[PDB]
Amino acid sequence: GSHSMRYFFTSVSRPGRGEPRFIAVGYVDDTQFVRFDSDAASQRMEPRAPWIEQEGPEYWDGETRKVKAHSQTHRVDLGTLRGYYNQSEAGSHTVQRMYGCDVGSDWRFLRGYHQYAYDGKDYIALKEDLRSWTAADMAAQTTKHKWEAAHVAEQLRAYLEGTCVEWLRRYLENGKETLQRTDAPKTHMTHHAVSDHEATLRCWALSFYPAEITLTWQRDGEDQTQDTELVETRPAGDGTFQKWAAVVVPSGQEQRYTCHVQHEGLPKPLTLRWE
């Protein structure tokens, strides 16, 4: 199917406590593969997936070097933003950055991203054409002017369509057994009596990959959206994911309900019924 590579960067200022915390992580699809933590002793980019561990010292020296340059940039940005918004020196603030690429089933480039957020809200974002910038306020517009004059979009576009895609493909190849696998959900249903007039019917999806899934309840064929308890898709901790949907069913209506499951690993969508 389709694939993506993402790097996520979080920079948090710590007033009167020295240098800001800086955390970097990289994902291929829903699999983390690298990290960097400024508060760690190593001070190096580190493997977080088995298939990247034996990439040579040249790889790790290079990623370590570049991520440190990322760190130094963010540290300055915190100050610059502190000024753009006339904020105090005693307040803690968060800068976030995300960039990466999407490819299709044919591993060909679909989309590129590069965007920043200041204290949890959009600040500046590269548009889909990878040629223009979205800035909301005056501060962001100022940054946008800097970046137009330094032709930032052009260099970013090169990476996004080039090395980003190029190296996403390599990771997919190297980690084939894991990154190119499709674990169809293991599904089951539980039934528990909340009282003597009602029972909880819960539909489970377990040990599936990737994370994207559709989990729905129907009563005699009609959607039960607002009457369905639906949890966020969650990691099992072993590289697979879980999710469940539940409905309160009145006495003797179990046969009316159907649980519906859609996932990359299932040829045809599953229909489950308590019976």
Binding site: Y7, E63, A69, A150, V152, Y159
Partner: peptide, 10 residues
Amino acid sequence: KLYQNPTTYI
């Protein structure tokens, strides 16, 4: 692989 930046500031 990480982007190789000049770098660029906000």
